[PDB]
Ligand binder design. Structure first.
Ligand SMILES: *C/C=C(C)/C=C/C=C(C)/C=C/C1=C(C)CCCC1(C)C
Length: 137
């Protein structure tokens, strides 16, 4: 597949429940939910190497990885982690994260290209899954 593109969010579900698992207090969860509704994802894919820029109104982050090679990033709530991305099918990748220090909930994310041209990203903390849907600009 080709994940490359400038993606804009059209749907964001269960994001508050995810942040609750992660210990975020109520008012910051609501503010974070409003932020998530302005999420944009810019992807440059070259083979199995990915350059991804995730951004809101006031913040932007870069995630660069090669499939199958360990790398460092942060959980959704900012804790540093070790990450490894594997394919699960032609069009979907899965990333498992392990905290660098301390412990916390089990976190992971997935990214998938649908046949309808949608990008579906999920983020998981233990039992709770946030699902986010994007379309190309
Ligand atoms: C392949 C796509 C990935 C790994 C995207 C992950 C998305 C995030 C880490 C999103 C984070 C946030 C917002 C969209 C808004 C509020 C602040 C965050 C960190 C919860």
């Amino acid at each position: 597949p080709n994940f490359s593109g400038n993606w804009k969010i059209i749907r964001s579900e269960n994001f508050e429940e995810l942040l609750k698992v992660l210990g975020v207090n109520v008012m910051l969860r609501k503010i974070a939910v409003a932020a998530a509704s302005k999420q944009a994802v810019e992807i440059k894919q070259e083979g199995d190497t990915f350059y991804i820029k995730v951004s809101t109104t006031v913040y932007t982050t870069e995630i660069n990885f090669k499939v199958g090679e360990e790398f460092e990033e942060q959980t959704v709530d900012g804790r540093p982690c070790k990450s490894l991305v594997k394919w699960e099918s032609e069009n979907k990748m899965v990333c498992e994260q392990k905290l660098l220090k301390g412990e916390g909930p089990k976190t992971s994310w997935t990214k998938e290209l649908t046949n309808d041209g949608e990008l579906i990203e999920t983020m998981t903390a233990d039992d709770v899954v946030c699902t986010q849907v994007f379309v190309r600009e």
